[PDB]
Amino acid sequence: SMLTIGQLARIFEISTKTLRHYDAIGLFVPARTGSDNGYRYYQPEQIEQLSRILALRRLDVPLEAIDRLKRDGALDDPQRLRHFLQRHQHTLREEISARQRLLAELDRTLATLAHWRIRNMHARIVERPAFSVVGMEYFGSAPGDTIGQLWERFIPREHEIAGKHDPEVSYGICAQQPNGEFHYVAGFEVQEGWPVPEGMVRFQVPAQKYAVFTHKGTAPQIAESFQAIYSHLLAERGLEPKAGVDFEYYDQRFRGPLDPNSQVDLYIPIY
Amino acid sequence: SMLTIGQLARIFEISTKTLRHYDAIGLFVPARTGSDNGYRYYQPEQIEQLSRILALRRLDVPLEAIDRLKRDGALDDPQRLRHFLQRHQHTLREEISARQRLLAELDRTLATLAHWRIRNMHARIVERPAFSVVGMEYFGSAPGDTIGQLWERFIPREHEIAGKHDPEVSYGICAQQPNGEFHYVAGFEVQEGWPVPEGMVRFQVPAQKYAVFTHKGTAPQIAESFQAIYSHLLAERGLEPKAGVDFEYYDQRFRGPLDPNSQVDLYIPIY
Ligand SMILES: Nc1nc2c(ncn2[C@@H]2O[C@@H]3COP(=O)(O)O[C@H]4[C@@H](O)[C@H](n5cnc6c(=O)[nH]c(N)nc65)O[C@@H]4COP(=O)(O)O[C@H]3[C@H]2O)c(=O)[nH]1
Ligand SMILES: Nc1nc2c(ncn2[C@@H]2O[C@@H]3COP(=O)(O)O[C@H]4[C@@H](O)[C@H](n5cnc6c(=O)[nH]c(N)nc65)O[C@@H]4COP(=O)(O)O[C@H]3[C@H]2O)c(=O)[nH]1
Ligand SMILES: Nc1nc2c(ncn2[C@@H]2O[C@@H]3COP(=O)(O)O[C@H]4[C@@H](O)[C@H](n5cnc6c(=O)[nH]c(N)nc65)O[C@@H]4COP(=O)(O)O[C@H]3[C@H]2O)c(=O)[nH]1
Ligand SMILES: Nc1nc2c(ncn2[C@@H]2O[C@@H]3COP(=O)(O)O[C@H]4[C@@H](O)[C@H](n5cnc6c(=O)[nH]c(N)nc65)O[C@@H]4COP(=O)(O)O[C@H]3[C@H]2O)c(=O)[nH]1
Numbered sequence: 001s002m003l004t005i006g007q008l009a010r011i012f013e014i015s016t017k018t019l020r021h022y023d024a025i026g027l028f029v030p031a032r033t034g035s036d037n038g039y040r041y042y043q044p045e046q047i048e049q050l051s052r053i054l055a056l057r058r059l060d061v062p063l064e065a066i067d068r069l070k071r072d073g074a075l076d077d078p079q080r081l082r083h084f085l086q087r088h089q090h091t092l093r094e095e096i097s098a099r100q101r102l103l104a105e106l107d108r109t110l111a112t113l114a115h116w117r118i119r120n121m122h123a124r125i126v127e128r129p130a131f132s133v134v135g136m137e138y139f140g141s142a143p144g145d146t147i148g149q150l151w152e153r154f155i156p157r158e159h160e161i162a163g164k165h166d167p168e169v170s171y172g173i174c175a176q177q178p179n180g181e182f183h184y185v186a187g188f189e190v191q192e193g194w195p196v197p198e199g200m201v202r203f204q205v206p207a208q209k210y211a212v213f214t215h216k217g218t219a220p221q222i223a224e225s226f227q228a229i230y231s232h233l234l235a236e237r238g239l240e241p242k243a244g245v246d247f248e249y250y251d252q253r254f255r256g257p258l259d260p261n262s263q264v265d266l267y268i269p270i271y
Numbered sequence: 272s273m274l275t276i277g278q279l280a281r282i283f284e285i286s287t288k289t290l291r292h293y294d295a296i297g298l299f300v301p302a303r304t305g306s307d308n309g310y311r312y313y314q315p316e317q318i319e320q321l322s323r324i325l326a327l328r329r330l331d332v333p334l335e336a337i338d339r340l341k342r343d344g345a346l347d348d349p350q351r352l353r354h355f356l357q358r359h360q361h362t363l364r365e366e367i368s369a370r371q372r373l374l375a376e377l378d379r380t381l382a383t384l385a386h387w388r389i390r391n392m393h394a395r396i397v398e399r400p401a402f403s404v405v406g407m408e409y410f411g412s413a414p415g416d417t418i419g420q421l422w423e424r425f426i427p428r429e430h431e432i433a434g435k436h437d438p439e440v441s442y443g444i445c446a447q448q449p450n451g452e453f454h455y456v457a458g459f460e461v462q463e464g465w466p467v468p469e470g471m472v473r474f475q476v477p478a479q480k481y482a483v484f485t486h487k488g489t490a491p492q493i494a495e496s497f498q499a500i501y502s503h504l505l506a507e508r509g510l511e512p513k514a515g516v517d518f519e520y521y522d523q524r525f526r527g528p529l530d531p532n533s534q535v536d537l538y539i540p541i542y
Contacts, residue, residue: 001511003501006451009412011497016412016451039451047502141280141287180277180287180310226282230274231318240272 002031002041011047012054027067028053052081059088114221118228123211123237125270130207133171134161134194135187137201147172147184148219148257154186163194172248173203205247211239212249213266219257222248222264229268244269273302273312282318283325298338299324323352330359385492389499394482394508399538401478404442405432405465406458408472416491418443418455419528425457432458434465443519444474476518482510483520484537490528493519493535500539515540 005016022028023040028050030040042050052075056066069075074084136154138147151172166189173185185203196202211234215225234241249265256262276287293299294311299321301311313321323346327337337346345351407425409418422443437460444456456474467473482505486496505512520536527533 001506004447004451006412006447006453007501009414010445010453011494011501013414013416013418013494015414018414037449044502044506047498051498141277143280143284143286143289145284147284174281176275176277178308180275182277182281223282223284227318227322230278230282231315235272235315 001044003044003047005030005040005042008042008047008050012050014054022050022053025063025067027063027070049076059085061088114224117216118225118233121213121215121225121228121233123213123233123239125210126212127209128207128267131189131205132192133173133185133187133203133205134163134190134196134200135170135185135203136199137183137185137203139181139183141181145220145223147186150184151186151257157197157200158188160197161188161190161200163190165189165191169249169251171205172250173205173245174247175203175245176243205245208244208269209242209271210246210267211237211270213268215264215266216262218260218262219264222266225266229266234268234270240271242269242271272315274315274318276301276311276313279313279318279321283321285325293324296334296338298334298341320347330356332359385495388487389496389504392484392486392496392499392504394484394504394510394539396481396510396541397483398480399476399478402460402476403463404444404456404458404474404476405434405461405467406441406456406471406474408454408456408458408474410452410454412452416494418457419490421455422457422528428468428471429459431468432461432471434461436460436462440520440522442476442521444476444516445518446474446516447514476516479515479540480513480542481517481538482508482541484539486535486537487533489531489533490535493537496537500537505539505541511542513540513542 005019009016009019019028019040023030028046031043031046032041033039034041053066056069057063066075069081069084074080136150136157138150170186170188173187175183175185177183185201187201187203190202211229213225213229213233215222230241246269247267249267251265253263276290280287280290290299290301290311294301299317302314302317303312304310305312324337327340328334340346340352340355345355407421407428409421441457441459444458446454446456448454456472458472458474461473482500484496484500484504486493488496501512517540518538520538522536524534
């Protein structure tokens, strides 16, 4: 009923070298040594002990910490050992708490960057002629950038589009109707004459003057950009919005909606 | 530079119904109504306001709470508004805390379940004759259930094995060597005479008497089961372990190493 270094190591999923190591340092020592083979032998009573020694290591308690507990008799006392552990528990809770306080201060600092980014978003003025776009429309005042959801409805189907004048760039078009809903469209510039994939439309973006803003960030943060633009950015440059169609401009600089390194040009029609 | 319900709703990704709603309740009322179309029109100065109303909603602040704030002047006061929010922030921290306190108490209870399960793990005695097993062998006193790792090394290769006498059941065999290492093997019972997939072995489990323990739980918890077995479960039944080969027994009752619903018979050779 005595166990070998190998049976012990097995049931605890450790290597026999560890158990040798523990023997040299007098931490966990075998009840005896094989008198005809020099092997180490352990009693079943030692199992629960190795179990605690190993329980400490899973808590990253350094080995010598452990050895000190062995030496001063605290490892083999359920009360002292418990004390050691609550102390370590306490430290862990604190280190966690401390970092939480940091994530808040960090959360705080990210916001401040947003006002900074928006402060640096300068208008370039430009006129562009009418042009044609084919893709997936959505007529209607809907909540969400369920457009983030539209784009993901549109991406599997993009390949279907013949006649792409420049497949490197795409558009997130929003048109106003006097009725008051917006008509959004995700698409690609295509020459007239090409066929429209089933369930797709062809939209004509009229000739317009624009203020172009380079949104440098995430697609969900696009709405914030629009908000600044319409609350003050235009005015601050004595520009007036014109009723018309605006669009998001996606080219090489765009690398995914959730990717903070994506730029997107915002084409705001003006007077 | 007045915006429509439609441009407003878009740049905030909400539906125009929401803006109608906010107007009827007097919460967010447009600066005017279209006199030739009865439409609603908003000033760019209302953007930041709608912005905060909506920020509250993202905090699940109910709408009526919000309307209360609007009514009692607090909503338009950066100081009162801030106070409202720290209050709410406070509540959230408390609710989180409370639940942590419960996770700990829950952790404690899970542990107590373990001793209970081990107490109910009864030995059934059984003799089985020698039998042959084919699979992937590991020689050597290794740490970790890198046996968890062996099984996942072995599984892509299982299909290769011809002559499987009973593919429903596999074995996790551990054999002891005089030098004290253990020799582990994951495999299937296969009749003699069948060829051995390259890099695989054929191990012979000798005829033995066993105590069988049904481990009901997770493969990582298998080691604890072994620990109970050799520390006292055998003694309590006046059984004595015999030097030999033990094995884990996987049949239908086994549903995967991570599934708390798996059972595994543990075959412990005895006198
Ligand atoms: N070569 C060697 N092996 C060791 C030694 N100490 C432990 N073992 C291994 O541990 C098993 C059981 O050891 P035990 O608890 O002393 O329990 C032992 C022990 O109580 C007794 N026993 C067997 N042979 C001897 C012996 O030569 N001298 C003594 N004093 N007792 C023995 O029978 C039980 C079963 O022994 P086994 O079935 O042979 O299997 C033995 C043996 O494989 C050692 O000093 N030398
Ligand atoms: N009262 C007190 N005395 C301290 C403290 N830190 C160091 N000492 C003293 O300095 C000696 C060596 O510390 P070390 O180089 O960290 O080397 C230490 C340390 O690395 C490790 N150790 C012992 N206890 C603990 C522990 O509770 N936690 C950790 N992380 N390591 C420990 O074992 C080694 C030997 O320690 P000792 O033989 O006890 O001897 C210790 C101890 O007498 C402390 O925080 N409080
Ligand atoms: N049908 C209708 N539409 C409305 C009303 N209120 C706002 N809008 C829409 O909002 C846009 C800008 O309105 P604004 O800021 O008053 O700025 C307006 C306003 O300052 C001026 N304006 C144009 N027509 C009229 C008018 O009939 N009366 C007044 N007082 N001003 C007008 O020209 C600016 C640009 O107007 P638009 O480019 O046409 O585009 C207008 C129009 O499409 C309304 O009561 N009825
Ligand atoms: N001092 C105080 N008075 C309370 C409290 N709970 C209820 N009352 C009183 O009871 C009235 C109706 O509360 P309700 O039916 O929960 O209906 C409430 C509630 O459903 C919601 N609401 C208002 N303020 C808050 C708020 O701060 N937090 C939340 N979660 N909901 C609010 O809107 C309604 C507000 O109506 P009121 O004009 O405030 O009128 C409130 C208020 O005068 C409280 O915790 N503290």
